[PDB]
């Protein structure tokens, strides 16, 4: 490892922050911790609903969670009762109250987190890493993306040694700051150990 984190290096310019809430120098830390809490929990629960990202905004001493995901229906459920349940159990630890807003994305194959977790979910099921990785790249590029590169690393295939293999297509400039690049790493626990599946998606020139 020697490369800077794609998202951090652009946090000010193109990319936004996931957490959006000014805080005093005091309740800043604690609030941040409650945040980490609701994030890890919410993710650990709505994992089956294929969540891409969450935006934790905090207006007027009241917390507001946003959930960008590919399947808003599974998240809400019938009538939106799951929404309520989640407002209860999640609002509880966030300090309350918590109005949540699900956000649909009709292009799931372009979200780095989604592609990552997809390849991963394929990797747990013994499927060949090359077929999965290349499948993801293929579907991405033909779905409409200026660039994408995926990268798997670990025992992959049950080898005695670990060997990193990355497959790319299109133009993906990591140094061009004006460039909008999606990025997400996701551990893929297997029978032989963890297999990292980090993916970059150059979405646009700006």
């Amino acid at each position: 490892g020697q490369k800077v984190h794609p998202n951090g290096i652009r946090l000010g310019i193109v990319k936004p922050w996931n957490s959006t809430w000014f805080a005093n120098t005091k309740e800043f830390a604690d609030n941040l911790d409650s945040d980490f809490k609701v994030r890890q929990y919410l993710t650990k629960e709505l994992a089956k609903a294929s969540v891409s990202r969450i935006v934790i905004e905090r207006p007027a001493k009241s917390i507001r969670v946003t959930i960008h995901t590919a399947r808003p229906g599974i998240v809400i459920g019938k009538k939106g009762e799951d929404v309520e349940k989640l407002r209860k159990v999640v609002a509880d630890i966030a300090g309350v109250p918590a109005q949540i807003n699900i956000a649909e994305v009709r292009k799931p194959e372009l979200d780095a987190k989604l592609v990552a977790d997809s390849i991963t979910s394929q990797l747990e099921r013994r499927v060949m890493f090359r077929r999965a990785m290349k499948r993801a790249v293929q579907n991405a590029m033909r779905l409409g993306a200026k660039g994408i590169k995926v990268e798997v690393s670990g025992r992959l295939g049950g080898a005695e040694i670990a060997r990193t293999e990355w497959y790319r297509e299109g133009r993906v400039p990591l140094h061009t700051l004006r460039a909008d690049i999606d990025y997400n790493t996701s551990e893929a626990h297997t029978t032989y150990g963890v297999i990292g599946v980090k993916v970059w998606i150059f979405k646009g020139e700006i």
Partner: protein, 98 residues
């Protein structure tokens, strides 16, 4: 009389927080002293980037904090109540002063 002071993190988020807190006041009751810039508080952090050893390599982060004064040299009634229940603009903290 109305000493409003509002601070945030992202500078161009408070630009419209101030433009909007001044419009929804200056138009219904007039009077304003404008968005007084104030110094930006910049806390810096110099964390070690390596989980173990390698003291030499460090990342240095910062948190720019942009303050803004408003000032309204008259307690206009259409304005003094246009502050409460008419603030919004989350991500930006705003403390009104009497």
């Amino acid at each position: 009389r109305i000493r409003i002071r509002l601070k945030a993190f992202d500078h161009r988020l408070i630009d419209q927080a101030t433009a909007e807190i001044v419009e929804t006041a200056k138009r219904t009751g007039a009077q304003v002293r404008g968005p007084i810039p104030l110094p930006t508080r910049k806390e810096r952090f110099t964390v070690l980037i390596s989980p173990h050893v390698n003291k030499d390599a460090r990342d240095q982060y910062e948190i720019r904090t942009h303050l803004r004064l408003v000032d309204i040299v008259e307690p206009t009634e259409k304005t003094v109540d246009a502050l409460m229940r008419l603030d919004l603009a989350a991500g930006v903290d705003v403390q009104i002063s009497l």
